[PDB]
Structure formats: structure tokens, C-alpha cells
Symmetry: D2
Subunit: 379 residues, 4 copies
């Protein structure tokens, strides 16, 4: 019964057999010598197929999510693409969230639709809407919780039962929460998706993705697509992601504490119309968040009274929060989803409000973050 922080450092990461090296080597190699034809050493043959550094990351992620198999990819989006290429085909249907990362929307609507996959965007916070959106062709329900960027909450255990009753898979994109705060497989999810670019790598310095599954056969079907389509994490990126994972617990603890302080500063600020944070008792889905999340995350969104004009001004004015896409780094980030990460959802059911600002609250000294926001908000 090893604890999460122990697993993050040790799972998949036994000291090297030959040398005792305490950290997994970077196997910057394409290929592997065989002892006679098919005589694999340690099961390795070609780095696309499997690479020992990538195996370490895959085994660690499986341990942290409580799954049987992890698979690492070149980006979050490549994990999504390999997943959907594996579980869908022409004629199938997907339920996606009505608030989700714009790239997810873009991949489903602009690539998979052209390849014959139908879809509907549903309010996943409303289990009735999810149950009635099921079609005979539905292969999967795609869940983000909290959603990007509104931080809406979906009851994983409830939606798992709806998916399974329809013989569909439940996919949970656990990027925002991370395995430290939320463990979807433990609530009946079939697949967990991550952008490891975010909290897992933790340092805004490595683009990557991952899948973790409960079912070994689905894991083998995904692995066939990992090998065949080849959208793999390279060994050095996998190595940096794994290095980041070692501090996930201590980072997330501080992200959550700093975000709670930032929410206190935003609530009742006269220029702020609305604060979105799953820890606020009146946030939609707060009680679901309390039952399925250890803590409420580092992400905070808010709507400016003065509209788009005011939101764009705040974004430009921060001196510690950096105006950039992405999230989950040690460094604080700010963005305007409507013109940045979610420009790809303009005109759709997933369009974000133009008065919204999204924060990734970092692990900087909290007074510096609060003071930076307060000066940026001053009209």
C-alpha cells in the first residue's frame, strides 16, 4: 500500500540493473541488438515500438492512475488522436463536452467528422442530457472535469454507469486535475487521457501526452496504434515528463493553496463579475468536486464586468503571471481563451465568453501573485 508520492518517484523506476544508476537512463537510441534473429534483449527491438525510458514513464503513469497499462505520446493531442483512431471507425458517434479544450473540439469536428465520426456536445454536468444523447452508434463519452476553461464538474462514477449501460467507453481527460487530485479509473472510467505538457511535466518545458487504461486488451489495441501510427513521446521528453512527475504532489499542494488565496482576492473585487473555481461552495458541481477530487486545482477563471475590453487589458497588464497559452507549470500563466486557446471554438456550442480570463496559478510566493493580479485589475 505505497503512497502516491512514493509511487511517483519509484514506480517503473527501479535502479538500473547493470550500473545501479538511481535515475532511469535516457535511451537515446533507435534500435537494439538481438541475440540471433528474434532474440530480444529485455524485450526491446525498436524505439517506436518500445523504448526503456518511455516504458518507465508509461509504468509510472499506470501506477499513479491505478491502471494496467500506460502509453506515452508526442503530445496530448496525439494521445487523443491515437485513442480515437483505435476505438472509433466511420459511422460511429462520440459525445463530447459542451466546454472543452479547443484542440479536442478541433480534432473531433475538423478531422474525425471528415473521417465519418458523428458527434454531439452535451452538458456533462447534466446526466439526463448525457443519457438522452446516447445513440445506437455511440462508442464513447468524452469527459473533461474540471472543464477547460469554465471548470465545470462531471460526476465520473455517474457517467461511467451511463456509458457502460450503452456498451460505450468512458474517456476522462484528467489533465487539469492530475492523478494526484482525481483518479477516474477508480470511479469506472475506461481510459484516462492526459496532456503531460501540463501538471505532470510541470515546468512548461515538454509537450507530451499519455493514455492509461484499466483493461489490458484495450491497452494492447492502443499499443498497436502507438506502434503503427508512431505518435510516440521521444525518450528525452519522456524523461523530463517523468522528472516532473516526481514533484507533482508538492507542486499541486502549493498550486491549490495559491489558487485558494487568488480566489479570495478575486471574489468581491469590484471589476470582477464572476469567479469560477470548483472549491467555491456555490460553484456549479461543488459537491461532486468534493466527493471525487482531493482538492480543487490550480486553475481559476473569472469574468470582467467591463467585457472583452477589460479582460484583454488585464491579460496585458500582469508582470508575474505570463500571458501565454498552456497551464500547469510552476510559473503562473494568464490567457484570454476566446482569442487564444479557444479561438478554435468560436461559433460552436463550445464558444467561451469574451469577458473571461483563465489563470494557471503557479507556485510563486502567493503575495506576489495576489499583488500582481490586483494591479492588473485596477482600471
Amino acid at each position: 500500500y505505497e503512497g502516491f508520492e512514493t509511487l511517483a518517484i519509484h514506480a517503473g523506476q527501479e535502479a538500473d540493473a547493470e550500473t545501479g544508476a538511481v535515475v532511469v537512463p535516457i535511451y537515446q537510441t533507435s534500435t537494439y541488438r538481438q541475440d540471433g534473429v528474434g532474440g530480444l534483449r529485455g524485450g526491446y527491438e525498436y524505439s517506436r515500438t518500445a523504448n526503456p525510458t518511455r516504458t518507465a514513464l508509461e509504468e509510472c503513469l499506470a501506477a499513479l492512475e491505478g491502471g494496467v497499462r500506460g502509453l506515452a505520446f508526442a503530445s496530448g493531442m496525439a494521445a487523443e488522436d491515437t485513442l480515437l483512431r483505435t476505438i472509433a471507425r466511420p459511422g460511429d458517434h462520440l459525445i463530447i463536452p459542451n466546454d472543452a479544450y479547443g484542440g479536442t473540439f478541433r480534432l473531433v469536428s475538423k478531422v474525425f467528422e471528415r473521417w465519418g465520426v458523428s458527434w454531439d456536445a452535451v452538458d456533462l454536468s447534466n446526466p439526463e442530457a448525457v443519457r438522452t444523447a446516447i445513440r445506437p452508434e455511440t462508442v464513447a463519452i468524452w469527459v473533461e472535469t474540471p472543464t477547460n476553461p469554465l471548470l465545470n464538474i462531471a460526476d465520473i462514477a455517474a457517467l461511467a454507469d451511463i456509458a457502460h449501460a450503452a456498451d460505450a467507453l468512458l474517456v476522462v481527460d484528467n489533465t487539469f486535475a492530475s492523478p494526484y487530485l482525481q483518479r477516474p479509473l477508480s470511479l469506472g472510467a475506461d481510459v484516462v487521457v492526459h496532456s503531460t505538457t501540463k501538471y505532470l511535466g510541470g515546468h512548461s518545458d515538454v509537450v507530451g501526452g499519455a493514455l492509461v487504461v484499466a483493461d489490458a486488451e484495450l491497452g494492447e489495441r492502443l499499443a498497436f496504434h502507438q506502434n503503427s501510427m508512431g505518435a510516440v513521446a521521444g525518450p528525452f521528453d519522456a524523461w523530463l515528463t517523468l522528472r516532473g512527475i516526481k514533484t507533482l504532489g508538492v507542486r499541486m499542494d502549493r498550486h491549490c493553496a495559491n489558487a485558494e488565496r487568488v480566489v479570495e482576492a478575486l471574489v468581491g473585487h469590484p471589476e470582477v463579475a464572476e469567479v469560477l473555481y470548483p472549491g467555491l461552495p456555490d460553484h456549479p458541481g461543488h459537491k461532486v468536486a468534493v466527493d471525487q477530487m482531493r482538492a480543487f486545482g490550480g486553475m481559476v477563471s473569472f469574468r470582467m464586468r467591463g467585457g472583452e475590453e477589460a479582460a484583454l487589458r488585464v491579460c496585458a497588464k500582469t508582470k508575474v503571471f505570463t500571458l501565454a497559452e498552456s497551464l500547469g507549470g510552476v510559473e503562473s500563466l494568464i490567457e484570454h481563451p476566446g482569442k487564444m486557446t479557444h479561438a478554435s471554438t468560436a461559433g460552436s456550442l463550445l464558444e467561451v465568453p469574451s469577458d473571461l480570463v483563465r489563470l494557471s496559478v503557479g507556485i510563486e510566493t502567493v503575495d506576489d501573485l495576489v499583488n500582481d493580479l490586483l494591479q492588473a485589475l485596477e482600471p
Copy 2:
């Protein structure tokens, strides 16, 4: 009119503006600060979308193939997958070679067929067979030349005219030849594919892929899929591939000279039934190779008189050639395609002979390579 070796070192690789750093930095970053919302610095916003180290590799590859746009991917197979997802849809048809990398076959037959793409494998050395294989649904002709592993030759300029007459694209997988020996865009190809894992990286230490195109609009459609599906080369892998490219000319020169010597040792060896090398005057397609290749490459295949049993024994017995998948490294590699790279083609039109051995002749001292083969061949 800069020469190839000059471009390989300089194209895309001006010294850094701020510091003068003569080598492109490794931009190990996920994201980029914007000067106000949408105020991109140098056009950068998020590493999946574009990363400055990956841009350098993409611009260099475009210069070497004479194309307008390069795109770098997580592997050769991911370049293939992004290409086919972009140019095909359900109902389309592909012509592929009757001798090709087993992964290419596997991606088309085991993934794209399930996604509604029909295909036929054709002898691309026979332009009549190619012309009659065109269907009204054909979107592309997929060419390897020389083929993996038989080293058969296809007349690029001839097949370009057949493709274009049918309003189809000509795709040339130029992995074996490299841009130093063969420039398909100059002969009317629409798309060049590479596994950069092979001769471009050159050191068996980085899995990667690339696409280069002549047409800027097709380049933008591919780039949309690079971003959306996210199967990108990470910056450190891109950086090592670019480092490898700097020595492509001098490496390939030596691969070709060492391969010619190895072919001399194999021809007439009493245990060798047949030697496959495009430089042999009686090799099928020799005259086409002379007109479209600067030299005939580092790859050599041969068939053992004593059958599969003899081929497997040679593979196990080399002490300088390493028994492993892959090719195009400085180090010599040997394999048995039937049980290794082309196990995925068993039972298909692309099945390889069980008595065949494939060599990637490296840049080691040639007498050591010849002597190693001669001892391995001795029964």
C-alpha cells in the same frame, strides 16, 4: 546557387539574433509569452503548433529537397499517418508498392482500410501496371525507390505523369536514398516522406519523420494536421536530426563507397545466390537508378543458397555488423526482413523471401566490414 553540403549546415540555421549562437538553441519550452493577446513574438505561440528548433529542421529539409515547406514528426510512421489523414478520406483508394517497409503496409492495410480507404499493391517498376491500377477514387500513388528491402527502382518522373494525369498525388518515400542522392520534387513528386530515423539523423539515436512539399497549400493542409493531431518531433529530437543532417553528404559518400566494396565481396561468393544493389548493371531498373540517383546507396540485400536456415545463421554470426532493425546509421546493421522488419508483410503481396538478408553498410573501415561478412558467410 549554394551547394547541398552548404545548405545542410546553413539553411534554416542563421546564427541566433540575440546572442550570435552559431548552433540553433534547443527550445525546450511548451509556450511563449505574447505582447498583449495575439501579440506573437517571432510568430510563436505553442510548441505543438510551431517550435523554433523544429522550424530550423523543417526549413533545412525543405531546402535540401527543394520544396516550399517541411514538417517534422514524431517518427517516419507519424509523418505517413499525418499525410494520409490529410489527403485521404473514407471511399478513397491508394496505390502502394509491392515491396515496401512493413510498417507502411501495416498502417495502410490494418488502420486506413478499417477507416474506409481501399488499396492495391502494384509493381511500381512497371508503369503499365501503375497506369491500369488507377481507379476513379485513387487519391495518391505511394512510391518507395529503392524499395525496402529488395531495392527495386521506380521511375519517379514517369509515375508523376501517370499520377497527375489521374488528378492524383505522387508521394515518394525518399528514406533510403536521402535528399543527397535523389530529389523527388525535382522529378514531379508532390510529397516527399522520410523516416529521419535513418540516414538524415544518421546515428541510430533519434526516431523521427518528415514531409516536404512543393505546393504551399498542401503544406498548410498538412500543417493543420501536424498541429491538430499533434504527432510532432520534439525539439531535442529535431535538434539531433538537424545535427545529423550536417554530415549527410560525407556519410553517404562513404556509405556508397563501402556498399560498392561489400557488393564486390558478395557477388560470386559460393554461399550467395543473388545480390540486390541498384549499382549492379543487371539489377532490375539499374538505368533508371543511374538517371535519378547521384549514387546507389548504402543498402545491400542478398539471398543465401542454403535458404532461411543459412540466412538466419549469417545474421547471428556477424561481429561488426549489428543484428537489429533499422538502417542508415554510421554503424553497420544486418537483419532478416522475413522475421524482423517485414514480419508484418507475411502472407501478403509484400511478403519477402525467407532466404534474404538485408545490410545497412555503415561507415566503418571497409576491410573490417568485408572480413566480418566473409567469416559470417563461411558455412
Copy 3:
């Protein structure tokens, strides 16, 4: 008045000017293009002299210690060697601690003595002994606090006054405490030394050293030796050290909390004769530690009742603590100084007790660490 955690992420680490890259690039370059002879771009000319990634690490370390200049080296020992080559010459004298890293002892006694530098080892916890050890030739007092491995405490401010009265420099090796817990320059130290291999890098994956100084002229004399002797941190190692520094605060917080719990488990364990931890009220120098350290660190040493035999058995029996040299990693480490890090002090005034075990308490889940020690201690 930016806080420590803010500085650790931001100092020296403004977003890239050209691209906005939020993380400092890895300038894996030897040299830099000049605009006419001596026309340096951004002040760069040759990576040994200065490298932009190494400058970022050097500026960050200067900010965290409150110094004017940082300098990064190939290892802790190379920082020590460059320091001593700069400030000493034949005929000079050094005061060193009577308990110190064995490599420090080895460099002074086995290299600098042969090069004409005399030395004495003194109890730095006894300011009278330090004051009477001053000789007319004394150039520096070399302080570790806490000491490696007994964790003895030296009053930095007191020893600074003794050094300065003698026109000598006070050097503090702040490796064990890190800048998060202790800031020697603020108490009158002239030079801070680190093995960045330990808590600063934080992940047992990069050997490196650093110097930070208060006085810009001493900084320039050291920099002349950094350039001339060339024992520099390479850019990728500097980059990983800088990545590690971003989480120093959150890591050290957890190291200190886990170490306090481990000390509770060891105190009164029937096999344990003595527990060494600066936070124990009866530890020698506890009151000095309270006034100069924010918290008492991740290191814990203890002496077994059953002697050397019992200590060696504990070292071999841990399953979560890894038996290895080094310290300050996220992963827990255990060692026997007498036969490992301090074999080099056997027979000297710095000989360690043979019944002593040294712990680097990591950031694993604390119950797993306590349970691992308790099973290892059971006879």
C-alpha cells in the same frame, strides 16, 4: 520585494526576447557569431567564457543567495577548486571544519597541501578555537553548517566577524541547508559554495557546483579562473539544475516535514544510540540553528547501539531508502559515511564514527519512509 519562490522561477529567466519562449533555451553551442571583430552580440563570444543558459542559472543563484554574482561549475568539487585556486597561493593557510564532506578534506589535504597551502581542522561550533586557529597566513575560514555528516552547527555571523577581524574571507558551503533555509551572505559570509548536485538540482540527475559572492571584484577574480581553468557547468546540466531550483521551496518544505517525522521514529528506538538533527532541542547548536535557519533540513544521522555491524545491516536492509552516495534528491538515500562518502577522512581529525548511518530523507509518502526504517532497524 519579490519572494523566494518567485525569484527561483523568474530571476535570470525573463521570457526569450525573439520568440517569447517562457523557459530559457538550452544553448548547446560552443561559439557565437560577432558583428565585425569584437562586435559581440549580447556580450557572448565563447561558451567556456559565458553561455546564456549558464548565465540564467548564475543570475538565479545570485538572486536566491542575495549576492552580486553567481558562477556555475562542473561539480561542487570544481567550484571548491576554482575558489581555492583564486583566493590562495603557496604559503597561505586555511581553517577547515573538523567535520566536513570527505571530498573537501581530500582536495585541501591531498591537492592544495602539495601546492603549498597549510591547513588546520577546527571545531567551528567553538568560536574560541576558530579565533585562536587564525595565523598571520590565514586567507579563509571554510564553514559547513550543518556539517556533513554529523549536522553540527556554526554561527555564521560570529565566524564572519572573526574572519574579517583577521582580513580573511568567510566561505560557507551552504549545500545541506540550501538558500531556501539559510542565506550566509546576509550574515557576513564573503562566498557561498554549493554542490548543486544536492538540493538545488534536487533529482539526483545532474552533478554541478556554484559560487555566489557579495563583492563584485572577488566575483571578477573568480570569473577569470572559471574562464581560464574552464571547469564550467555545461548548458544542459545548468538547465536541469535551474529546472530543479524552481521546486526547491516545495521540495525542502516536504524534506523538513518528512525528516521531523523520521527523527520522531528514531528517537527512543531501542536499537538507536543517538539521533543527530539540528531541530532536536538538545542537539549541539540547536539555538544557533533556530536563529540562522528557516527550518532544520532533510538530513538525519544516527548511531546504532550494535556498532559498525548494526549500521552496515541497516544500510543493506532499506527497500525505499536507496543505499548510495549523495543527498538532496526527491528520492530517499541512506549511506554509511565511514566506508562511503567519508572513507577519505579515515585516520584524520575528520574520521566519522563507524556506527553512524546518514539519511537523506526524500519527499516520498512519510509513512512509507518510517515503515521502511522501522523494518530495517529490527535486528
Copy 4:
């Protein structure tokens, strides 16, 4: 009797035992798990002491120079510093060249002199001057051949006999020639020094140094200083140096051929007063170069008729040759030693002529290099 190119790829570089990885892993680790106290795995204990990636580079360099032991350092200058700290002490004397890298001069005159080592600069092309410069205190003769930047030649075998008759060591800095062109240990040198930054790494992207010795005991004394002073090559830099070494033969072949063409363009150019190249029959020491070098190198120096003013203009005007310090990269470099690499020798016996330009002729297409020089030379 394996050949040089074979050794460069294979020596020290057997495929990984556990996984078969064909390329040496990057052991980005500080420490190594022991099986009981002192139970080393594969002989590893701490990365400063030894690191498996650095061991591979050290073993490869030993094979290429024909020595018993290689040692890798953080820079060329750090290799020099560790060497001199090992073999000299206060009161000793060194003979150095009268034309040498300015950093070598700076380390000896500005650091080791202050530490009690006397020195004289001698014309090493004149064995009589070398023999009469020997003092009873002389511990070593330090040889560059060809010299930096005049490319003067020293007869290694002759100077070895002079050194050995005096019970002194012969040190040869073989940076410019590389082990591919010249093997000083085979001619009686005791120590070979390299800046691996130059031709060995080969890509202007990794600062590093090395020592190789014939005598295992001197190797152990040097290794004690490598460990104790800690000026080690880090594993990723060692790995890139080793990657570079794989193409040394093919690169140097092309450097030598391109340099011979550049010399033809410079000889008789009306603006050029003198061309310095060891392959010119009238170059001082040409016959010695023919007997001890396989070929005459990539470096070319020349003196402008129009003095310093003309030399500085040429340096600024090249568009393919990059104006920067350093040499031995695939990319062509140009500099003015008097104001750049050898500003540190101004006012000494090693002062370089102010009308001199130094070229590192790269492996770009030769016509582009010749045409670039011809336009830069045009007044």
C-alpha cells in the same frame, strides 16, 4: 587490427547488456545503488568519480590515440588544468611553445606562475632550442603541432627523446590534428591533450576536453585529480562528443580536401602576403608534417598585404565563413587571432601578427567557400 573508423564507432560502445540499445545511454544520474555497503554495481558509485556515458567516451578516445586510459573534462582548458595540477608543483618548470592557444598561455602565465611554476616559451620547431631550455626543475615539454594559429610543426618523436633524456614528460596538444591525422603516443608522447570542443565533437555544440595516456600509473594520478578537483565532462556533453567522434574520419577527409582548395585560392591572390598551411612544400616543417600527419588539416592562416586594417575587413565581409572564436566544426569559421583568441598573448613572446586571419575550413561545398573568400578579399 580494427581500423580507425571502426574503432571510432565501436570502441567503448558495445550494445547495452540489458536492452541491446545500440547507442550508449545518457546516464543522467548523480549516483548509483550499491548492493550492501561497497557492493558496487558494474564498478559505479558517483558520477564525478565515474559515469558510464563518460567511460564510453574515455575508452573510445583511448582506443583512437592508442593509449591505456582516457579522461574526459568540462573543457579543453580543464583537461590542461587537471594535467598540470597533477604533474607539477611549486618550484617546477615547464617549456611551452612560442605559438600556442592564448588560453594555454594564460593558464600557465597567469595561474600556474602565481602558484610557483616557472616557464619558458621556446621554438619547438628548433630541437636545439628545446634541448637547451631544459632546466633541472623541468617536469614537462608542452607541444602543440600544428601550432595555433601559425600552424608551425614540431617533430614529436625528436622532442620525446629530448624530454625523456631529461626525465621530463612530453605533452602533445593534438587538438588541431585529431587522432585521425596524428597519434602522438605512437611517437613517444606521454600525454595527449584535446579540446574535444574542436574536431572530435565536430559540430560547434559541446565544450569539452580530454587527456589520453600511455602509462596506467600516470592515468591513475590524473584520475585522482579528475575525481578530487571534479572538472568532469557531464554525461550529455560526453554523449554528444562521442556522437561527433563517429564521423571524425569522413569529416576530416573533407576538411583536408576543402582546405587544400582554399590554399590554392589564397596562394598568389594579390591581397594575400603569405599563406600558412602544413601541406605547402615551402611551409616551415613541411617534411616533418609529411612523416607524422596522415594529411595536413582543416586550418589555414594567412597574412593580408594591407595590414591589420585589411585583415579586420576580410573577417567582417565573409557570408559563409562565420566570424567567431573556435574551430573544427562542420561549419566554416574565420577570426582575427590578434583581437580574438590570442588577445591574451598580446605583449608576450606568443603575440600573433596583427595582419593575420585564421580559417577553420568547414565541410560546406568547396566552391561556396572559395567564392566567399574571394569576395571578402576583394578591396
